[PDB]
Amino acid sequence: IAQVQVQNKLQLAMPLLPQEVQQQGVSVEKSSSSFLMVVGVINTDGTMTQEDISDYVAANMKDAISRTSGVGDVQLFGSQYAMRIWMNPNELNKFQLTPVDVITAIKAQNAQVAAGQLGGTPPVKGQQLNASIIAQTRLTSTEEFGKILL
Amino acid sequence: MPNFFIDRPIFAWVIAIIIMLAGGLAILKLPVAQYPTIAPPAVTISASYPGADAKTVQDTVTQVIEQNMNGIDNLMYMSSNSDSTGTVQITLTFESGTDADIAQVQVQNKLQLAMPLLPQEVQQQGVSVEKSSSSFLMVVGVINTDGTMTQEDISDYVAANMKDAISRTSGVGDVQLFGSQYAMRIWMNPNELNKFQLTPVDVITAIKAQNAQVAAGQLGGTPPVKGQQLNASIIAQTRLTSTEEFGKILLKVNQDGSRVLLRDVAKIELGGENYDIIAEFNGQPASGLGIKLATGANALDTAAAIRAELAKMEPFFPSGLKIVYPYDTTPFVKISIHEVVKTLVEAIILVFLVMYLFLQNFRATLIPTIAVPVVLLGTFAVLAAFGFSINTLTMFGMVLAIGLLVDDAIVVVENVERVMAEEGLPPKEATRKSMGQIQGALVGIAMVLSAVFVPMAFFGGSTGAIYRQFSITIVSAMALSVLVALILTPALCATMLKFGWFNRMFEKSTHHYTDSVGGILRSTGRYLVLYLIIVVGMAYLFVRLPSSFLPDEDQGVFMTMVQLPAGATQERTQKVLNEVTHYYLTKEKNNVESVFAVNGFGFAGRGQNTGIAFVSLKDWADRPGEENKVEAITMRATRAFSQIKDAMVFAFNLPAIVELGTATGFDFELIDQAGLGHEKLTQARNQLLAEAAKHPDMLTSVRPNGLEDTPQFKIDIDQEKAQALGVSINDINTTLGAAWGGSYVNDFIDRGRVKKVYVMSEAKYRMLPDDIGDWYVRAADGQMVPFSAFSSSRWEYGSPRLERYNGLPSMEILGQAAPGKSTGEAMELMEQLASKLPTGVGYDWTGMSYQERLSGNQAPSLYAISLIVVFLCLAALYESWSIPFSVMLVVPLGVIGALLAATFRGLTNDVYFQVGLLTTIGLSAKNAILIVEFAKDLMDKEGKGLIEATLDAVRMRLRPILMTSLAFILGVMPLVISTGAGSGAQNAVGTGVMGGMVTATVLAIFFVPVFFVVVRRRFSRK
Amino acid sequence: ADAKTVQDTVTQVIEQNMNGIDNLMYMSSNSDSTGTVQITLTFESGTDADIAQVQVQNKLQLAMPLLPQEVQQQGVSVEKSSSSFLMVVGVINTDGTMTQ
Amino acid sequence: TAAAIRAELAKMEPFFPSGLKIVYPYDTTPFVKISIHEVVKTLVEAIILV
Amino acid sequence: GVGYDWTGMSYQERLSGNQAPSLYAISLIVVFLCLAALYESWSIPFSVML
């Protein structure tokens, strides 16, 4: 219940926190402050990095334990991956370009759009043939982000 | 206690009175519903992204809402659908006992905080978190009978006058609706609108200004100055309330004062929100309203109560609109509760008619009739004392126990006339002496029967709950009996006691029979060798008999399963529903009440593709033939339908507990577990599937419970091209969406209700790919560009339904046992088959085959502990690690016969038969308690002989057995075993008992005396 | 929002969902000319106010999305309400060094 | 709980990459097990000393 | 068309009153039964009750 009440009140503020903060994900937990245990993940093969494991572990093992009943909190000792657009300000300048530009770019070239379908839900006369119209797809590799048209 | 109670008498009654009062008083505080709450509790999150498609909905909504379901307590597993109508559904099934009222909070609260990461368009529609529990108290259906209202209009009336009316009605725990609510439709046209150089954006972002509503201020109000006379509230802009006000929307004006109204590019009019589910009731426009229970309410009370509120409002409907009931889970409960309560009334007369035909009174036989209805009314209070409800399960939980309730009554009042006759005292003084032979052995059948019952009520979950439903009812009745037979029946029959031809006509058969025992006991271990051949039969009778949950039953309705091929259309499916409608009406007009046909719903998925036919029948009365019932009509229809083209049309009868673990089948989940793709995961599944049909000796019907990949049309906006032209990705993407997907603009107030406004291209200019070019967007400079300038278009293979088990893309494949083998075997092969699949693919077990796993083999382990409590309990009743071993060997004598309903009918090993299998081991041991008690009573007290007592025990016993056994094999005889309708379990409840209660007696009489001697002569040595 | 265009547009929508909730005894709301809604659900004596609060928030949620944007991005609080103040600690300042 | 984390991970292991081990740096569970299994070990052996 | 109902204090008050001639009833019935019980007579209550 306490968790509930904390959260009803939080929820009233929610509309006031900067978009940037919501965007992250305001969390609300009911846990002990003590670590109950620490789960270590190594690479013997030397076949991966740390940079690689933080990510493996996150995309692959963190959600499970996170949803395990009784685990009121999980800390990841590291981080998951993200697409990283490590800007350079010279270049950005060379070609008359702010970071603003890069974002507004990354925004429209990296999207998922709903484009209805063919046998239109409320149809005509009488038609066979019905399939989804599929438009833009979110890029999925350093490779395509790289090809963004600036 | 009874001897220092026989006297009190007056007292008792009181007690009685009370018990009987409290019991009756509870019969009122009691809930009634077909079945009681037995599915693990679970919450579905549902969401919509208008005109989406799987991949989108899945990568844009579902994975979000999952990487968030965390910090929530008691999650068993979570499942997820992301189809291609733009709908996500996520269900989290919870641990068995978790309060569901707080499971839902925690979910929907950890959701509340993922929201901001959801697409602006989903956050509108609103994501829903309710309790998944499709146990439906009934589904009305408002139809109009004179083509004057449509699907959508009828929807509107229902949503505007009756929905709330019902929603606030004495019980109704949830009121869901079978249609829309009359959303404001505005159906653009590229042409009507290219001739102006307008996109849908100009339409969109211009409904938002015209149909808004802004704040203003008060006059005096907030801090004024001086003295002021007036304060009032300023009313600014406020929302349009008609299709006319929407027609007049200045979308633009060219140089000459041009009247470019919304009217002119589009087309306004009231219509549905959604438009791709078609409800029809016997060929007519339908739009019903489904309703759930209440939690602690009455299925009959509110059932009746709903019809009242409908009755009240029926003078209001204009153009003749009937209010039909193609599903009510009430007449089924009622003439199943009117039955059962008959079994009581009757099995009572059975103990009047027997008893009389044995003692021949009208004072002693009346005691039992007055004694039992007291034990019953009274258990109804202990039920209600544990929350329990009167329900199909708890109901039979007593009927299956009337045998044990009666036999206590008879046994007491019998052993008084086998004292006050056999050289005996008056009334009072006889009962007093008899409550010394039974006294101990009753408060000893009690503990014994507390075992072989309680160790039930302790099983897994989903099913384990159904069991408890019996246990608590029985063990409640059973123990409430012993209690009532130590206090009331002694003090009753000691204050009321002193057909014809009989007597000696029996008294020469007690002598004939007892000489089958003694005089034939010369060899001794003569018959024990036959008994090993009854055990060694039973142990073969088990393994053969098939397993089951709950005898599938005729309930008032059943369903047809239309399923058109890949790209098929709602229209194309209607015809296929039209045939079904016809066949069911025209060619079965004397069983079929109505077919409620809904196209757009279905089994494995939703879609323009499939539908489902809900068919309700005539009153089982008017369905007289045995083939006029359901198992037969489906027999027909099912096959009667495999005479249609591409349109797999099935038809099956619902399982008894509608919202529960169906087949004895398995539920298998193939999960991902590396960056393996859809495509990869498919190949993997397609292997397993293939590799599984190779073993029909072990699995039959391995199958995907999911849609297969279908084709799709990939519009593909060339960026550079658009950059070069004056046209922005934003205006592009909308316009495709807008036209084709439809979009939800703002709201407006039709008739004092808030109702949505949708905006979307007319059906004409949005059907075939060749239309894609129809549409233009205005670039930077102000010139319409056709999509072909900045698109390509290139047919490809997608997936209309994407699946996920516990946060990883799954693929649910469900298959059946095997004609011969056991579910546990099917599962276990299915696992070896899983085990040789391309690395990075895993399997998990869900649904039924999830409980089946966790719990599973337990029945032969809990009873391992009943038996140990029974022996340990029993031994103390006597005084030996030996004498009780004589009472237990009775067990099989009930099994066999009961187990011999593999023959005397064609049936299966199920919940019912098993509870019956307990009531039968119940009388059987309780008889062996009394017999072995006498053989120890007069052998201990009157000093009697090694085998003198054994003769004189069964001597004084043979009739008490015979009295009750005949009451029962006739009390269990009626519609119970050989029934018409509203039945099924009826046959199951009894057939177990009936024969098997035969062998429990007509075989335990020659046998248990033998049992008392095969111990003692072995225990004590020489 | 002005009462008629307040209630019915928000009040209805919430009110409309407040069905199911165990031991509901009597609901009663009122729109406002300021645009302010107060639905009150008072449950049977006995009744676990905390578990009562919880359902009144488990239903309210199904109403939420159907509510205006401004109404949403603002309030909507469900709280274990009473009616009568117990106390009124007032506060004045001696020596007109302070104001209303 | 730590039964179930250790149980979850279990069903997770089969599908890792090449040289990926779960190691156990820190954990309060075992002591608490070893702890009571010593107080109860005493419970026995001291009935052995009666 | 216009109906009514009590609320707050009223609804509580009303309820109190309607209950009473269902309260006195049971209470009596309980006493009566309690005498017959541990005073042995199906007749002395009949007379105490008077």
Q: What is the DSSP letter of B36?
A: -
Locate B574 and state its tokens.
């209607």
> Mapping DSSP to helix (H, G, I), strand (E, B) and coil, where does residue B592 land?
strand
Nearest CA in chain D to B838: D15
Q: What's the CATH code, domain B38-132+799-806? A: 3.30.70.1430
Task: Answer yes or no: are the C-beta atoms of B1018 and B883 closer than 8 Å.
Answer: no
Q: Which of A37, A39, A47 sits opposite D17 (nearest CB)?
A: A47
With an 8 Å Cβ cutoff, the interface of chain D facing chain A consists of: 1-2, 4-5, 8-9, 12, 16-29
3-state secondary structure B906-952: CCCECHHHHHHHHHHHHHHHHHHHHHHHHHHHCCCCCCCCCCHHHHH
> Mapping DSSP to helix (H, G, I), strand (E, B) and coil, where does residue C6 land?
coil
- Measure in Å the smallest separation between the Cα of D32 and chain A Cα atoms: 12
Cα angle: B410, vertex B1013, B533; to 5 degrees: 90
Give me Rg for the CA atoms of chain E.
18
- Amino acid code (one letter) for B578: N
Q: Which of A26, A27, A133 sits opposite B740 (nearest CB)?
A: A133
- Measure in Å the smallest separation between the Cα of B759 and chain C Cα atoms: 18
Place of tokens 């009918």: B905
Locate B912 and state its tokens.
């019912």
Q: Do D26 and A47 touch (CB under 8 A)?
A: no
Sort C71 into a burial class: Cβ within 10 Å, 0-12 / 13-18 / 19+. middle
Q: What is the DSSP letter of B105?
A: H
Q: Which of B876, B19, B714 is nearest to B371 (CA)?
A: B19
Q: Which of A135, A138, A100, A103 is nearest to B732 (CA)?
A: A135
Q: Give the integer Cα–Cα distance in Å for C29 and B992.
A: 58
Task: Answer yes or no: are the C-beta atoms of B127 and B310 closer than 8 Å.
Answer: no
Q: Do C65 and B129 touch (CB under 8 A)?
A: no
Locate B328 and state its tokens.
């009510």
Q: Which of B1011, B847, B12, B932 is nearest to B490 (CA)?
A: B12
CATH number assigned to the domain with residue range B133-179+276-328, chosen from the 4 options 3.40.50.11270, 3.30.70.1320, 3.30.365.10, 3.30.70.260:
3.30.70.1320
Domain A79-150 has CATH 3.90.440.10: no
Sign of torsion, CA A69 A75 A77 A82? positive
Alpha-helical runs (H) found in B798-947? 823-834, 848-854, 859-877, 885-888, 891-898, 911-937
Q: What is the DSSP letter of B771?
A: G
Per the DSSP assignment, residues forming a β-bridge with B758 are: B185, B744
**Which residue ranges does chain B devote to CATH 3.30.70.1440?**
660-709+807-854
Cβ-based contacts of D26 with chain A (< 8 Å): 35, 37-38
- Kindly give the pairing relationship between strand A114-117 and strand B42-48: unpaired
- Which positions ≥6 away from B800 have C-beta within 8 Å? A132, B53, B54, B83, B84, B605, B607, B707, B710
Place of tokens 């600014």: B236
- Measure in Å the smallest separation between the Cα of A78 and chain D Cα atoms: 15
Q: Give the integer Cα–Cα distance in Å for A103 and B903.
A: 78
- Amino acid code (one letter) for C21: I
Neighbors of chain C by Cβ distance (3+ pairs < 8 Å) = A, B, E
Q: Give the integer Cα–Cα distance in Å for B327 and B133.
A: 16
- Measure in Å the smallest separation between the Cα of C41 and chain A Cα atoms: 17
Q: Give the integer Cα–Cα distance in Å for B791 and B787.
A: 6
Q: Give the integer Cα–Cα distance in Å for B372 and B553.
A: 30
For chain B, counts of helices (H) and of strands (E): 40, 29
Q: Give the integer Cα–Cα distance in Å for A125 and A104.
A: 43
- Which positions ≥6 away from B38 have C-beta within 8 Å? B462, B463, B465, B466, B469, B657, B660
Neighbours of B533 (CB within 10 A): 9
Q: Which of B72, B95, B737 sits opposite A114 (nearest CB)?
A: B737
For an interface test with B, give the residue of A130, A137, A140, A145 to mutate (most B CBs within 10 A).
Answer: A130
Sign of torsion, CA B93 B99 B101 B104? negative
What is the edge-to-edge ordering of all strands in the sheet holding B842-845?
Answer: B128-131, B42-48, B87-94, B75-82, B802-805, B808-815, B666-671, B842-845
Q: What's the CATH code, domain B1-37+329-499? A: 1.20.1640.10
Q: Do C28 and E7 touch (CB under 8 A)?
A: yes
Q: Give the integer Cα–Cα distance in Å for B797 and B799.
A: 7
DSSP B23-35: HHHHHHH--B-SS
For an interface test with D, give the residue of A54, A61, A75 to mutate (most D CBs within 10 A).
Answer: A61
The kind and range of the H/E element at B809 are strand B808-815
The CATH class given to the B660-709+807-854 domain equals alpha beta
Per the DSSP assignment, residues forming a β-bridge with B43 are: B92, B131
Give me Rg for the CA atoms of chain C.
18
The CATH class given to the C1-81 domain equals alpha beta
Give the Å distances, CA to CA, from B654 to B328, B391, B553, B630, B692.
Answer: 14, 19, 8, 10, 27
Cβ-based contacts of B56 with chain A (< 8 Å): 112-114
- Which positions ≥6 away from B246 have C-beta within 8 Å? B184, B186, B207, B211, B240, B262, B268, B748, B757
Q: Give the integer Cα–Cα distance in Å for A28 and B763.
A: 47
Neighbours of A44 (CB within 10 A): 10
Q: Do C61 and B129 touch (CB under 8 A)?
A: yes
Give the Å distances, CA to CA, from B606 to B334, B403, B452.
Answer: 35, 50, 48
Q: Do C28 and E11 touch (CB under 8 A)?
A: no
Per the DSSP assignment, residues forming a β-bridge with C40 are: C28
Chains D and A touch (3+ CB pairs under 8 A): yes
Task: Answer yes or no: are the C-beta atoms of B25 and B326 closer than 8 Å.
Answer: no
Q: Which of B209, B192, B205, B210 is nearest to B267 (CA)?
A: B192
Q: Give the integer Cα–Cα distance in Å for B902 and B434.
A: 41
Q: Do A127 and B768 touch (CB under 8 A)?
A: yes
Give the Å distances, CA to CA, from A80 to A27, A47, A57, D11.
Answer: 18, 18, 8, 21
Cβ-based contacts of B768 with chain A (< 8 Å): 118, 127, 129
Q: Give the integer Cα–Cα distance in Å for C14 and C62.
A: 9
For an interface test with B, give the residue of E26, E40, E43, E46 to mutate (most B CBs within 10 A).
Answer: E40
For an interface test with B, give the residue of E5, E39, E42 to mutate (most B CBs within 10 A).
Answer: E42
Cβ-based contacts of B806 with chain D (< 8 Å): none
For chain A, counts of helices (H) and of strands (E): 7, 3
CATH number assigned to the domain with residue range B555-659, chosen from the 4 options 3.20.20.120, 3.30.70.1430, 2.60.90.10, 3.40.50.150:
3.30.70.1430
For chain D, counts of helices (H) and of strands (E): 2, 1
**Which residue ranges does chain B devote to CATH 1.20.1640.10?**
1-37+329-499, 500-554+855-1022
> Mapping DSSP to helix (H, G, I), strand (E, B) and coil, where does residue B15 land?
helix
Q: Give the integer Cα–Cα distance in Å for E41 and B793.
A: 99
With an 8 Å Cβ cutoff, the interface of chain E facing chain C consists of: 7, 11
Q: What are phi and psi of D21, to 5 degrees?
A: -105, 145
Place of tokens 């019907």: B701
Chains B and C touch (3+ CB pairs under 8 A): yes
Q: Which of C43, C38, C46 is nearest to C78 (CA)?
A: C38
Q: What are phi and psi of A69, to 5 degrees?
A: -50, 130
With an 8 Å Cβ cutoff, the interface of chain B facing chain D consists of: 673-674, 839-840, 842, 844
- Kindly give the pairing relationship between strand A132-134 and strand B711-714: parallel
Give the Å distances, CA to CA, from B135 to B47, B90, B848, C78.
Answer: 22, 19, 18, 29
Neighbours of B447 (CB within 10 A): 17
Sort A121 into a burial class: Cβ within 10 Å, 0-12 / 13-18 / 19+. buried
Q: What is the C-alpha end-to-end distance of chain C, expressed in Å?
A: 30
Q: Which of B966, B971, B993, B990 is nearest to B979 (CA)?
A: B990
Give me Rg for the CA atoms of chain A.
23
3-state secondary structure B551-591: CCCCCCEEEEECCCCCCCCHHHHHHHHHHHHHHHHHCCCCC
Q: Give the integer Cα–Cα distance in Å for E21 and E1.
A: 32
Q: Which of A46, A48, A68 sits opposite D5 (nearest CB)?
A: A68
Cβ-based contacts of A144 with chain B (< 8 Å): none
Q: Which of B894, B904, B917 is nearest to B989 (CA)?
A: B917
What is the edge-to-edge ordering of all strands in the sheet holding B796-797?
Answer: A114-117, A132-134, B711-714, B796-797
Q: Which of B689, B684, B687, B707 is nearest to B699 (CA)?
A: B689
Q: Give the integer Cα–Cα distance in Å for B979 and B551.
A: 13
> Mapping DSSP to helix (H, G, I), strand (E, B) and coil, where does residue B778 land?
strand
- Which positions ≥6 away from B387 have C-beta within 8 Å? none
Per the DSSP assignment, residues forming a β-bridge with D26 are: A38
Nearest CA in chain E to C43: E8
Place of tokens 């004694």: B371
DSSP B230-272: ---EE-------SHHHHH--EEE--TTT--EEHHHHS---B--
Give me Rg for the CA atoms of chain D.
17
Give the Å distances, CA to CA, from A94 to A28, A89, A91, A97, A99.
Answer: 45, 8, 5, 8, 13
Place of tokens 């014994």: B448
Resolution (Å) of this entry: 3.3
- Kindly give the pairing relationship between strand B755-759 and strand B611-617: unpaired
List b or e across C73-85, with b for residues whose CB sees 16 or more CB atoms inside 10 angstroms.
eeebebeeeeeee
Q: Which of A1, A8, A15 sits opposite C78 (nearest CB)?
A: A8
Q: Give the integer Cα–Cα distance in Å for B789 and B725.
A: 9
> Mapping DSSP to helix (H, G, I), strand (E, B) and coil, where does residue B748 land?
strand
Q: Which of B457, B171, B204 is nearest to B294 (CA)?
A: B171
Place of tokens 């407040």: C18
Q: Give the integer Cα–Cα distance in Å for B338 and B343.
A: 9
For an interface test with E, give the residue of B7, B11, B488 to mutate (most E CBs within 10 A).
Answer: B11
Locate B663 and state its tokens.
């087949």
- Kindly give the pairing relationship between strand B75-82 and strand B802-805: antiparallel
Side-chain-facing half-sphere of B273: CA atoms under 13 Å: 18
The kind and range of the H/E element at B91 are strand B87-94
Neighbours of B289 (CB within 10 A): 24
Nearest CA in chain B to E33: B14
- Measure in Å the smallest separation between the Cα of C22 and chain A Cα atoms: 18
What beta strand segments (E) does chain D contain? 20-27
Place of tokens 């045939």: B579
Q: What are phi and psi of B38, to 5 degrees?
A: -135, -5
DSSP B147-184: SSS-HHHHHHHIIIIIHHHHHTSTT--EE--SS----E
Q: What are phi and psi of D20, to 5 degrees?
A: -105, 105
- Amino acid code (one letter) for C75: G
The kind and range of the H/E element at B959 are helix B958-971
CA B302 from chain center: how many Å?
19
Q: What's the CATH code, domain B180-275? A: 3.30.2090.10
Nearest CA in chain A to C75: A12
Q: Give the integer Cα–Cα distance in Å for B490 and B82.
A: 68
For chain C, counts of helices (H) and of strands (E): 3, 2
Dihedral over alpha carbons C42, C43, C45, C47 (to 10 degrees): -130
DSSP A27-85: ------SS-SEEEEEEESSS-S-SHHHHHHHIIIIIHHHHHSTT------SS-------
Cα angle: B392, vertex B395, B397; to 5 degrees: 115
Cβ-based contacts of A15 with chain C (< 8 Å): 72-74
- Amino acid code (one letter) for B481: S
Q: Give the integer Cα–Cα distance in Å for B185 and B179.
A: 15
Place of tokens 């039920």: B383
Give the Å distances, CA to CA, from B896 to B449, B456, B511, E47.
Answer: 20, 21, 28, 60
- Amino acid code (one letter) for E28: L
Locate B540 and state its tokens.
């073969």
> Mapping DSSP to helix (H, G, I), strand (E, B) and coil, where does residue B131 land?
strand
Q: What is the DSSP letter of B613?
A: E
- Measure in Å the smallest separation between the Cα of B128 and chain C Cα atoms: 6
Locate A128 and state its tokens.
């066979």
Give the Å distances, CA to CA, from B500 to B361, B503, B659.
Answer: 11, 7, 56
Give the Å distances, CA to CA, from A36 to B68, B132, D29.
Answer: 21, 34, 8
Q: Which of B103, B750, B97 is nearest to B465 (CA)?
A: B97
Q: Give the integer Cα–Cα distance in Å for B396 and B407.
A: 18
Q: Do A63 and B59 touch (CB under 8 A)?
A: no
CA E16 from chain center: how many Å?
12
Q: Which of B980, B814, B921, B909 is nearest to B550 (CA)?
A: B909
Nearest CA in chain E to C28: E7
Q: Do C19 and B167 touch (CB under 8 A)?
A: yes
Cβ-based contacts of A65 with chain D (< 8 Å): 5, 8-9
Q: Which of C41, C37, C48 is nearest to C74 (CA)?
A: C37
Nearest CA in chain E to C26: E7
For an interface test with E, give the residue of B14, B313, B487 to mutate (most E CBs within 10 A).
Answer: B14
The kind and range of the H/E element at B471 are helix B464-485
Q: Which of B192, C22, B761 is nearest to A116 (CA)?
A: B761
Q: Give the integer Cα–Cα distance in Å for B49 and B61.
A: 9
Q: Do A23 and B116 touch (CB under 8 A)?
A: yes
Provide, for chain B, the percentages of residues in helix, strand and coil under a 3-state DSSP scheme, each rounded to the nearest 5: 45, 15, 40
CATH architecture of B710-798: 2-Layer Sandwich (3.30)
Sign of torsion, CA A24 A30 A33 A38? negative
- Measure in Å the smallest separation between the Cα of B737 and chain A Cα atoms: 4
CA B334 from chain center: how many Å?
18
B469: left (phi over 0), alpha (psi -120 to 50) or beta: alpha
Side-chain-facing half-sphere of B160: CA atoms under 13 Å: 19
Q: Which of A44, A47, A71 sits opposite D5 (nearest CB)?
A: A71
Q: What technique solved it?
A: X-ray
